[PDB]
Amino acid sequence: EQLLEVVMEGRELRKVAREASNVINANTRVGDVPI
Amino acid sequence: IHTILYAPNGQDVEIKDYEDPIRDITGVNGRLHVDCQYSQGRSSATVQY
Amino acid sequence: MQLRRSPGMRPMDRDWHQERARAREQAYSSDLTSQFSESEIVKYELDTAQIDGSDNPRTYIWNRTIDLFGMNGTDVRELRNR
Amino acid sequence: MQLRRSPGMRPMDRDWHQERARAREQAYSSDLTSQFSESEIVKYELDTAQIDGSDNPRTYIWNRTIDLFGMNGTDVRELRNR
Amino acid sequence: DLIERNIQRVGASLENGINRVFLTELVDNAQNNHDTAGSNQGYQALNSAV
Amino acid sequence: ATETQGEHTFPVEVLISGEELRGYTAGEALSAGEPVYLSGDYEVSASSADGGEFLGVNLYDVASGEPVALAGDDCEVRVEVSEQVTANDEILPDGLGTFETVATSAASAGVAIVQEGAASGEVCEAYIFAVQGTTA
Amino acid sequence: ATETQGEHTFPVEVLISGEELRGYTAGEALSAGEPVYLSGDYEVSASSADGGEFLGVNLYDVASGEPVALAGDDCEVRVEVSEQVTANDEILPDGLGTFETVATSAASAGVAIVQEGAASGEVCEAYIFAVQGTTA
Amino acid sequence: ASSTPQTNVDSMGGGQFNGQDLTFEDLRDIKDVRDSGGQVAQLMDYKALLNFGEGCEIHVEGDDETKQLVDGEPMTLSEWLEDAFPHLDLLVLDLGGDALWYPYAVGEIQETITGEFKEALPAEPWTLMPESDAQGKVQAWHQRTKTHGGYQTQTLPADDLWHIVINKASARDEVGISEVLRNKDEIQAFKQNEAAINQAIELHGFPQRHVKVGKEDGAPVRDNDLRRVRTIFDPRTTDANTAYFTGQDVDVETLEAHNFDYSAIHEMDMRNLTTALGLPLEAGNVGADGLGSGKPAELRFALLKLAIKANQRSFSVQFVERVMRPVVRDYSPFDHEADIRLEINDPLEDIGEVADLIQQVGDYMTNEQVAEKLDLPAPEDDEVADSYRSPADMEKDEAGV
Amino acid sequence: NEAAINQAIELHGFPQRHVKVGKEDGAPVRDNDLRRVRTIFDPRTTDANTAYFTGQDVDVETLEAHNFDYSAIHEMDMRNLTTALGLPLEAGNVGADGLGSGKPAELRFALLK
Amino acid sequence: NEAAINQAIELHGFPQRHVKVGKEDGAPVRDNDLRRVRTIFDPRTTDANTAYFTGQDVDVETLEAHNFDYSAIHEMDMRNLTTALGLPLEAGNVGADGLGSGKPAELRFALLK
Amino acid sequence: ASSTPQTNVDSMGGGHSYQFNGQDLTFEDLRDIKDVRDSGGQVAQLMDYKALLNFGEGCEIHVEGDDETKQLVDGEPMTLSEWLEDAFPHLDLLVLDLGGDALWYPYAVGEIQETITGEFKEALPAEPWTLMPESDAQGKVQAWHQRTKTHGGYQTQTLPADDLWHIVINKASARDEVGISEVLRNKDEIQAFKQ
Ligand SMILES: [K+]
Ligand SMILES: [K+]
Ligand SMILES: [Mg+2]
Ligand SMILES: [Mg+2]
Ligand SMILES: [Mg+2]
Ligand SMILES: [Mg+2]
Ligand SMILES: [Mg+2]
Ligand SMILES: [Mg+2]
Ligand SMILES: [Mg+2]
Ligand SMILES: [Mg+2]
């Protein structure tokens, strides 16, 4: 005899921001974009 | 005139960095145990104004 | 923080499964108070285990007072008509 | 002539060093009468040793009645911020 | 590198502590004293202390 | 206290943040998130309705006589309130296994401060900052 | 709060000791060493006078709506006082962004104990030992 | 068939790391086992020394036909490779060591300032983890390195690093397995029992004196009174000459040394650990009954040599394919599609058995083949090298006839 | 059986000190009192040549290491497993008497080949 | 017999701790009282070098590992099974005394061939 | 590829002050190795046996195509092997002494020296506990920092990683230029033995 060594997942949300926008990897926590 | 230094670990000043991953802080801490004593205080003369 | 006994963690504990199986195999009835300690009932959440005596092997085993045919220990759920 | 116990010779005796170190690690307070034999107080000149309980490891070790987290036996003068 | 700077500050601060302990013992517990009485300071005071 | 996600009910994690964990003996059966007080030598029991009876909150369900982990003061905890509460309210053990406000109680001073408000019968988030004993 | 060395003025490090540092949203613009209290759900604003409004001191300058770190009631801190204080004085917020004594305040209990004395407008060193919320 | 893999490979992660089958923390954990020293580290170092410590040789098929002017002087591809990699015996031991400890050995190609080849430069394997595509091939390398009080992290393309994997989950496994992490439980079991033994030796390994004072059911003795007795019987001041004189109401009892078989516990730990790491028990300085001689011995040394051969073959192929061929292609006048092989020597050869073989069947081997088996340079004259009867036997005839 | 052995070695492989306090049929000793006795006899600060001085009503007993043949259990497990996988026993770093030489050795190696 | 040995090793192969509580012919101890004692001597939270302090009325007894020669039982089972299947005894990883060399070996190998 | 390494090397530390860095080793850690070496007994003899095994049996210098090197050095012919055997007359002792010190300490380290005429004198070794390297962010040693005892205190000085040389037997990685002391790697085992 051995357990069901499994875990059922919960709800998983849709992750898209990183594709759906311009991503800046900033050098500083605070900064400016010139317009 | 003797500078007596003591450390439970090693001999010199003990200076360590450590990271707190709960707060995202590096702490830098220094410790030393010290005393100073003459073996022969007659072997020194002070100059006084 | 979650301890091994904390209520959200119990389903992850290998012992919580193993002792609930142990309790199912060991009961004669759904009446927990007559069979288990308050410690066992709380620690292993035995109210929520389907305890009723139906999974105890000894529910199904012949245990006759005079056994001419050497037949005690036989389990009825192993007969051909089951 | 000088004997091992003679007052001018005590600082030459290895045991006078070793036993004063022992005495500092034994104590919980400066009260020598509470802690040491009157022979030891005289033989090792324990009045002149800085006995105060600050050198005893047991002053700094945690020893709670119940320990669910393995805290007991830690020495506070060995923590990160000490 | 702030961590190198902080290691340097901590090391300096300990060394300053040693120097304070040293100089305080040295000055307080010297058994000889040349009192210059506000006069003949410099070499003559230094030779007198020797 | 419990959260619903579809069919499922999940127990809430009681201790949000906190360095202050200590082990006592249960003087009676206790359940996760109950406020408790000293009832004998290292023995801990459910707090009654007003001041003078609070050491911390129980972290897991116990039978009588079992070892109990408490979250003490310096801890942030998810606790059920029997009353509607708001941020900056001081709260106190209610005597019913919940907390209530100091303003509702007979007491003048609380044991925890609400950081995140809740309706009656609902989970607030609060910081435990004091313990209360017998002052007469 | 500031320290002078020669020509130069330096910022004072608010935190002397302690690890009870916690995160909130600023309900308004706040400044380092300023006492704050809960103005909303996980939101803090500058403390008014005479008690019932203190969770900790703001550790660095922030604009409104920014996340803010706060030193809580196990920390040892450098803070500006509106009046002369001395060792063993209990102190609490002024309403002015500083601290004053329980002796001058209309309140009866403090939140920090002065460990090193200071004149009016100077920086004392104090140990934060309590928080104060709404008791009614 | 097809030109692209059409089975999937169980490896494309959900997160924003590429799944991180091991994380940088696990890689530091391997580094921490390695740097901790003691018996565990020495066993894994013996594993590295067996697999790679005996050094290497480079072969090319049709090497003579490669003869080309490199810099006015002629070279073969073997001669060029031996000049390109002067210290390959050290590099093979270093990379082979890393590729047993960690999931992979990994490194850069390096150039002189003039842009001629300098070296294959290994990189610290605990600092690097691969990121890989839906067909399991490595596309980028992500590197995290210590700095004062924290870390710097960077990403490099798979284009200009190289990597080698000894231990694999499958033939498609381009990421590999750490044998340390694969056996971490046995390592923990060993280390915990070591500490348990050490503490038990202190408490229980030595007898301790127990002086009991006062008569049973007689007058009670207080702490004040025991301090004076303690002063008399103090072990710190006692010797082999010391004798004791007492009334009837003082008893000098002994807590005996309480025997337990720590030797059997150590031998069990070492058996579990050596077998888990695939070494023979003998590597752990532990012996065994009925295993020291005959076919029982010959099997375990055969199993060891097979394991060594399998690792060597796996390493050799990947070093040639991922390191040597690119270096020939990019910095050499020779053909990179030449049939290069890197052999690694067998650590457990008996030269006396080789000499016995040469005496018994040399009459069927060329002088070149004999020189290869004997680990010597092949003869200068290709005729004497190619011939089957001894060069000394040809000399005595060529002179004597 | 590996798990059972490892757990049994921790519980039973090493001696453990059992201090008993008070006289049999005498005055009872309470929990508070034992805390002070524990402070005297604590293994954490004890060392190899520590000596004890007591009244007649303190007994330093020992839970002995309770011997069991875990070597024989490991050998039995290894014998079962190796033969189940068709390997010779020696692949498990376990030996056997009589089997190590002569026609008995010739046979097991013939079976393997 | 394999099943019987495997079960017997679990029950009897390892010593088991038996804490006896209360004075003989003294005050009785109930289950809720034993729960608190079980919390102290719990093998789950006990470690290799744990030490105990008690009054005179707590006894840490041991069920010793009760020895039985399961090696001889396995050898006998294998001796039956191999001979019943007409295999030589050596195929079962067992072997026998005085049988590994000389005319005794020549005979068994002749019979097998 | 590149003419400089693009992989980083995990190994910042210290500056002028002490740090419990883990990658670096202090003059105290170095003088601890000196103390294990000179305090004697079974531990010291085992590490001396380790040195004698690795380096005690002496050495031989080879040059491939040595005969082709035949040249007049000072009105007399030599090969490179013959010149090297004159340059290093007692190389066997140097190999044992350096090789032993490189098993004790993380490295052996030393100078090159010249006669007054400027011809080669010897590769004079340096006392390894007195010296520690400074290394850059990409992994090379750039300077050597020396601390040496004088009359109840210390001299200190710095030297470029130019006219010194150093040898490392034991390494943390194939890219390690500073190495590991097998003594400090096993300090806990040594103290367990002594206790
Ligand atoms: K009420
Ligand atoms: K006012
Ligand atoms: Mg800006
Ligand atoms: Mg004088
Ligand atoms: Mg503090
Ligand atoms: Mg906190
Ligand atoms: Mg606090
Ligand atoms: Mg009396
Ligand atoms: Mg009585
Ligand atoms: Mg009765």
Coordinates of C-alpha atoms in Angstrom, one line a residue, chain F residues 78-136:
Chain F
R78 CA -5.6 36.5 10.6
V79 CA -8.4 36.4 13.3
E80 CA -12.2 36.2 13.2
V81 CA -14.1 39.1 14.8
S82 CA -17.6 38.8 16.3
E83 CA -18.1 42.6 15.4
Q84 CA -17.6 44.8 12.4
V85 CA -14.1 46.4 12.8
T86 CA -12.0 49.0 11.0
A87 CA -8.2 49.9 10.7
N88 CA -6.8 51.4 13.9
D89 CA -9.5 49.7 16.1
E90 CA -8.0 48.1 19.2
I91 CA -9.5 44.6 19.7
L92 CA -9.7 42.2 22.6
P93 CA -10.7 38.5 23.1
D94 CA -14.5 38.2 23.0
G95 CA -15.0 35.1 25.2
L96 CA -16.5 33.3 22.1
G97 CA -13.3 32.3 20.4
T98 CA -13.4 35.5 18.3
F99 CA -12.1 39.0 19.1
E100 CA -14.2 42.1 19.5
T101 CA -13.3 45.8 19.8
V102 CA -12.2 47.4 23.1
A103 CA -15.0 50.0 22.4
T104 CA -17.6 47.1 22.6
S105 CA -15.9 45.4 25.6
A106 CA -16.0 46.4 29.3
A107 CA -12.2 46.9 29.1
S108 CA -10.2 50.2 28.4
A109 CA -7.2 48.7 26.5
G110 CA -6.7 46.1 23.7
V111 CA -4.2 43.4 22.9
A112 CA -4.2 43.7 19.1
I113 CA -4.7 46.5 16.6
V114 CA -6.7 46.0 13.4
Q115 CA -4.7 46.6 10.2
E116 CA -7.4 45.4 7.8
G117 CA -11.1 45.8 8.6
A118 CA -13.8 43.0 8.6
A119 CA -17.5 42.5 9.0
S120 CA -19.0 40.6 12.0
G121 CA -18.2 36.9 11.7
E122 CA -15.3 37.6 9.3
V123 CA -11.5 37.5 9.2
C124 CA -9.6 40.7 9.9
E125 CA -5.8 41.1 9.9
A126 CA -4.4 42.4 13.2
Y127 CA -1.1 43.0 15.0
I128 CA -0.8 41.7 18.5
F129 CA 1.1 44.2 20.7
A130 CA 0.3 43.4 24.3
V131 CA -0.6 40.6 26.8
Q132 CA -3.0 41.0 29.7
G133 CA -2.9 39.2 33.1
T134 CA -4.4 39.4 36.6
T135 CA -3.9 43.0 37.8
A136 CA -6.9 42.8 40.2

